[PDB]
């Protein structure tokens, strides 16, 4: 619902969406909540938030350390959901998506996980290690709780996969970093957001020109956090400048 | 879609990032084609026989069973080139890599045994071998690290996470996700995403096939039970496979009990863990109440995989195979006993399997039973560890 | 008087104190009877096959000979239980000890390989094993010393003389002189007083017998030459024996050249020593101008016997076999080359034999030749030594 | 010749011979020459002298160390022969026998070794590691140079060996430590001298009563040397007391 409204509003303004990613609890609960509020105040159209996991086999060094820092802070899934509830209570319309690892969703029951997402106000969930081939239980539980199941459209994909992602995905299609973008639209796929490697304003403008509904940036965001650990204030200042720049490029 | 079933009951699957699915599908197809290719089978058989030393002996251990009605045989994978069963399947996977036109090899290792096997196979077959190992394991496995380098393999320390096997596993996957085009990930156990559990079993199946032929030749009948340690599950499923349809033959897998199941410091996820999704599969695992993945503790470095092969979880669920645990101390006693009474130094991993066979014998001395223990490897590598302990 | 000829030309004999002659005569008679006893042969064959792992593979090494007209095969004694050829004859000698009604075993060892073999055989066959080792060797062979003790053998350090192998040899003889009634001296090489050179050769002859059968099966013809390192001479005569009457087959023994023959620091008495009488035999030896016995220097601990088997000295004298030397550095290069190109870690002893085969190939790249190198043992035991060196 | 005269003279006196053994050059050339003169002045009827060898596989710990001490002194075979010449020049009638290891005799030629023995005045040579079975070259060379080849009659021997030792031996038969003594006499064997383990006067009297022509003592002698290394004078004093006691028992 929030993704639908967002893209409709962004379309009426002929502008793309800029979606930053950060790990919940990194480098701490308090600072993370502040980081998130800064990202929103800076121009973020939506948020992608990660729940600290012991073995993030889909993340590079930068995010691996974000999780490490989060764990050093004692961050747990239960606390992440408390943070999510708070974030939603403060920001009613911004789309909030989670980046999860399968075991955290499966742990206490898949249905229960998505039910918790709905109660705190989450809009979408992308499970990193669940390919479309194993997605049935997950997207079914997502749909039952009005949560959009996010699917990754890889660059090394084919027609078959494109059709699956288009019919199974909701909210937005995660386009890994043109022709695919056209195919997705042809198959009525959820708006495409390009991710992976997006760290400059020009890349954001490029994505929107290619036909994507927007772009997602994480590592670039996380790097600002890790390089200003000893300077909480400077960290926020830098974050604001980066997001504002990336957001401006989407217009 | 796939050519073969990725599941064993509820266990298994292909829980990997979408990016890695083409690599898995390619591998499955290559495997299926290789299995029906007489030329591939001939080459694999040639390497196993003339390079690795198959068939391995089936040794009757008469001294250790004295005074009881137990007859015990040891399948001697300790005599295989490399010192462990790991060599069998790496040779097959290496040939598969070549069949797919790949020139590089990626491997993960904890104890270093699979790493050494991967390195030797790569040296022989002209493959550029890259091995990931948890920084903590690298530190305590300097010998194996040197052997790998001596054989031309690049050993890469992994400092992320707990810096152990599971972390090395993650690093291997992240590497392969962006290099599968030219490199093959040689997984070291019967776990991980399909098709690995199936491929590893098939490339280790000769252990059980040989054992069956040898026991029929020597005893004229099948064993009452075959026993093997279970870390990830490869040596055990290799022994079990050919006996699965022989209902009268018991299949007993032995997980490490570490300091004792009640202490929480063990490596027995199959019987004392909880099902979860990690390392590309749905299987029982060592995990916190929250769902974070934990490490498996054991005196033996090789029984460190924090989960277990999906086929073992399945065989357990339907009651075809039974799984038990053996503690550090029970394994140590079995290690000392085999050395002193049979002149064979077993790997501490294998010592867990032997310890359970000894328990079966000792608990019911007058029970007539024919047992086969899979001696997965030699223990020359554990001499120092055992020394430090006894000396302490 | 004796049943068999104690001499090979001018070399050999029974130069021991009168007190030990009855022990030698008893042993010779027991050996002769055992050789014509189908029951003894059956038992020995059973142990070799089902316990030790015979037959061992004959591996074709294709990568190392690339670009030349040399075809090289490696007889894999490294895959034998224990890690070296030593196991073959200790099993036979242990059975002989039992045939004579002896319950104790006396053994000498330098590197510790024969000591480990003696210990494992004694553990299996229920013999009380006592092993003498030069105090200097004990200090640098802690691993092997522990393996021997783990297998129930008593290791006795010898501080007399240079505290090395030759001194251990003397201690073994002095012990046996007063215990031959209940104990058997399991000599570890094809040297010493008759009947040992003959017995060891016969109990190691399967190396060459298997090699002949395997090479005929694989190449359809006999090798142009078989190559083996020579410390005392057991693995080499074991390989040579079945080929002695095949005049077209060259027999090449490789002695350790150490830092170089011209430095005097080597272990090549056959070609650079002088005939003398020591350790119960007349053979070439490392000795001073005055006649005092010296030590053999080599990077490899196993090529430390300061003399050489009398049959090798004889085969050399009549020109049937040719002997050469290989330096520490040449052996080290061969060790590294086999690891990197064939995925096999050879013993540093065996590396001397490989180094000479590599020289034969490299010196005349276009010479068509079929060679077999006896890979007497695996080199896992030498990993640290090679490491310290390369690191240095 | 000297053994013949000695036993004839000892027979006319109804007394046995006491023959001590010591390693040449132990603990040094000078002290060794003094030790030897003391043994003679104390009552020794004959001498058995060892030439330091690297691997005395027929000697126990006591003598093993005697050789060690001799080597520490730089004693060599050439020097041993110089000592022997001197000893003979001082004592013209005492029988002098050498205890050798085969390689020292074989080294520069067997014939040459015995020829050197004859020139310095040695009377017999016992080669420890040369059984009667391998003795041909040695006893032949000994006889050619008027040297008596000494053979060991073990306790675990048999008629065959007894006959060989009786026909091949000269000077005296080395009887390892009764019935054998009678057999030797029956076969006209050289007078028997019992050795090994003789360390007390009673043992010397016992040997003579059994029918032996005398007894040989070494380790007991060498032990006195090693236990008085720091007291050259006391060493000699003790040696004199021991030899006199052992000699007295032979009367
Ligand atoms: C002799 C022996 N026996 C048993 C095992 C356990 O694995 P398996 O259950 O796959 O058979 C190992 C594993 N070794 C793994 C895990 O550390 C490696 O990376 O070398 C072994 O080396
Ligand atoms: C692998 C290997 N290859 C060669 C040799 C040399 O002996 P050989 O000449 O008798 O064959 C040895 C000897 N080893 C002897 C001497 O130290 C021992 O006591 O263990 C060996 O261990
Ligand atoms: O959005 C997230 N990535 C942040 C990384 O930073 P960036 O390089 O800027 O996207 C992100 C998205 C999907 C994901 O799973 C998988 F890898 F399998 F696709 C992992 C991380
Ligand atoms: O006479 C010598 N022994 C001195 C040892 O002291 P003791 O115990 O008193 O004789 C002596 C005599 C023979 C000998 O060779 C062999 F051992 F083979 F017989 C070695 C030493
Ligand atoms: Na496990
Ligand atoms: Na030698």
Describe the biggest sheet of chain A? 9 strands, parallel
Taking the sheet with the most strands of chain B, its summary is: 6 strands, mixed
Number of strands of chain B: 14
> How many beta-strand segments of chain A?
9
CATH class of the largest domain in chain B: Alpha Beta
User: Helical content of chain B, roughly?
Assistant: 40-55%
The spatial strand order of the largest sheet of chain A comes to 5-4-3-2-1-9-8-7-6
Q: Specify the structural class of chain A.
A: alpha/beta
The backbone outline of chain A, from C-alpha atoms, is: globular
Terminal-residue CA separation of chain A: 23 Å
Helix content of chain A: 40-55%
Oligomeric state of the chains present here: heterotetramer
Number of helices of chain A: 12
Tell me, briefly, the overall form of chain B: globular
Number of domains of chain B: 2
Strand content of chain B: 15-25%
CATH superfamily of chain A: Aldolase class I
Using the coordinates shown, work out and report the CATH topology of the largest domain in chain B. Rossmann fold
PDB class: lyase
Keywords: aromatic amino acid biosynthesis, carbon-oxygen lyase, amino-acid biosynthesis, tryptophan biosynthesis, lyase, allosteric enzyme, pyridoxal phosphate
Assembly: tetrameric
Entry title: Tryptophan Synthase (external aldimine state) in complex with N-(4'- trifluoromethoxybenzoyl)-2-amino-1-ethylphosphate (F6F)
Structure in words:
The complex is a heterotetramer, with 2 copies of chain A (251 residues) and 2 copies of chain B (392 residues). With 251 residues, chain A is α/β, with parallel strands linked by helices. Chain A has one domain: TIM Barrel, CATH 3.20.20. Helix content of chain A is 51%, strand content 14%. Chain A has a 9-stranded parallel sheet. In chain B, the strands form 3 sheets. Chain B has a 6-stranded mixed sheet with strand order 3-4-14-9-10-13, sandwiched between helices. Chains in contact: A-B, B-C, C-D. Chain C binds chain D through residues 1, 13-22, 160-161, 166-167, 169-170, 173-174, 177, 276-280, 282, 285, 287, 290-294, and chain D through 53-61, 64, 68, 76-78, 102-104, 106-108, 128-134, 151-154, 156-157, 161, 176. One sodium ion is lined by residues 231, 267, 269, 296, 305, 307-308 of chain B. Chains A, D: Tetramer of two alpha and two beta chains. Chains A, D: It comes from Salmonella typhimurium (strain LT2 / SGSC1412 / ATCC 700720). Chains A, D: GO terms for molecular function: tryptophan synthase activity. Chains A, D: This is Tryptophan synthase alpha chain.
